């Protein structure tokens, strides 16, 4: 069961050289060569590092890839940063054959000053118990680079019944906006005692606690 | 100039057999592999099938129950067989080029355009417009979000309004989720100042061409 992880999101500024990863998790990634593919929003996926060092005639040789058997994880380098290598990077490794890859990674240029988000929590309103529904509602704006992950808890527990998170569009200010639900009953919302949505931005976190 | 080009219908029902055949322009299979690729919705590529100019095939072993891949060197294609489709199968299929030795593909230089193959049996539905009441209370920033949540509509798209577009500060549109039972949903709040809430009137005005549902909801500070 050998599968493919990349780094939601990786902040850094054009001018310095950025790293990408991708870890194996069951096998090791010596036994095939690794592939990097960068996805620009709205393009297939075209080949950036290729035989584990080389590049495609055409592409500059600052994309540099490298393989580390020591933890079994991959590198996608970025010498000269540029603000035109906002794509989607993805990996490759072999499974007996298996095209798999990972999960994405996105890459941002950072021509902004790096902004906190603000998280606002609305619990189901009074509303949708006659209709036997129940959702909890996260929002989360202003903020930069827009890529953050949301793990909904249950009585301080994990939980991913209903977990529908889509990519955050472009605001009037250039900023981000977040979308993460969780689709319930209104058996479980009257069920537990602590409801919260989290997003990890970056490396620091903002939560709040909405309770019925 | 290698070309690659795939197609099929696009729209399947569970417990279906899913065929697809991708043609190749410009070339043989002679020595050069072809691979199936899908891209299931939010995350990365994977493969099903393989197979050459003779007939071997390689297969993915989760989905090797399910996969049939088949060459027809007479007019230069190759085929996708996707028996017992369920809902976790939604992706666009790509077929890409290979060249390589002893099974395993050592170069990928072209891919295809990739088709969109839909698994799902949700009917056409109105959407179930949810007003979301914040705490009404001024918080360490002097904001208040009110809005309307937008559930179980089938399918795309559905656009929200405020105050038939009277508010434009704080409203922002978003773009769809999916529910695994077949159906969708949306979001819209308006970030109104903390001093001009409680007394000011903001409603959300909800449009689902596809079901012809307009509705029009009330949203209240607290209770």
């Known amino acids: 069961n050998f599968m493919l992880t990349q780094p939601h999101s990786v902040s850094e500024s054009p001018g310095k050289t950025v790293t990408i990863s991708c870890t194996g998790s069951?096998?090791?990634?010596?036994?095939?060569?690794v592939q990097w593919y960068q996805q620009r929003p709205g393009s297939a996926p075209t080949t950036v590092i290729y035989?584990?060092?080389?590049?495609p005639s055409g592409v500059p040789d600052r994309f540099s890839g490298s393989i580390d058997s020591s933890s079994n994880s991959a590198s996608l380098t970025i010498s000269g940063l540029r603000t035109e290598d906002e794509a989607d990077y993805y990996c490759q490794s072999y499974d007996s054959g298996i095209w798999v890859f990972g999960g994405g990674t996105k890459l941002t240029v950072l021509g902004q000053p790096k902004a906190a988000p603000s998280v606002t929590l609305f619990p189901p309103s009074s509303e949708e118990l006659q209709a036997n529904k129940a959702t909890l509602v996260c929002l989360i704006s202003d903020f930069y680079p827009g890529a953050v992950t949301v793990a909904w808890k249950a009585d301080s527990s994990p939980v991913k019944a209903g977990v529908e998170t889509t990519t955050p569009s472009k605001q009037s200010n250039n900023k981000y906006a977040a979308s993460s639900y969780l689709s319930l009953t209104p058996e479980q919302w009257k069920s537990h005692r602590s409801y919260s949505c989290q997003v990890t931005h970056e490396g620091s976190t903002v939560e709040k606690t909405v309770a019925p | 100039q290698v070309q690659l080009v795939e197609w099929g219908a696009g729209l399947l029902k569970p417990s279906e057999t899913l065929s697809l055949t991708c043609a190749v322009y410009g070339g043989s299979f002679s020595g050069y592999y072809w691979s199936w690729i899908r891209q299931p919705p939010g995350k990365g590529l994977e493969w099903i099938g393989l197979?050459?100019?003779?007939?071997?095939?390689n297969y993915n072993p989760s989905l090797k129950s399910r996969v049939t891949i088949s060459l027809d060197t007479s007019k230069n294609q190759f085929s996708l067989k996707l028996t017992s489709v369920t809902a976790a199968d939604t992706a666009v299929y790509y077929c890409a080029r290979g060249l390589g030795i002893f099974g395993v593909v050592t170069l990928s230089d072209v891919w295809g355009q990739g088709t969109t193959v839909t698994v799902s049996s949700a009917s056409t539905k109105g959407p179930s417009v949810f007003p979301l009441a914040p705490s009404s209370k001024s918080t360490s920033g002097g904001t208040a979000a009110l809005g309307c949540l937008v559930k179980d509509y089938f399918p795309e798209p559905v656009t929200v309004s405020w105050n038939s577009g009277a508010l434009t500060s704080g409203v922002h549109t978003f773009p769809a989720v999916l529910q695994s039972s077949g159906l969708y949903s949306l979001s819209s709040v308006v970030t109104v100042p903390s001093s001009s809430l409680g007394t000011q009137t903001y409603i959300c005005n909800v449009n689902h061409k596809p079901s012809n549902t307009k509705v029009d909801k009330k949203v209240e500070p607290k209770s």
């Open positions: 069951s096998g090791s990634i010596a036994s095939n060569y």
């Open positions: 035989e584990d060092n080389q590049r």
């Open positions: 197979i050459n100019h003779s007939g071997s095939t």
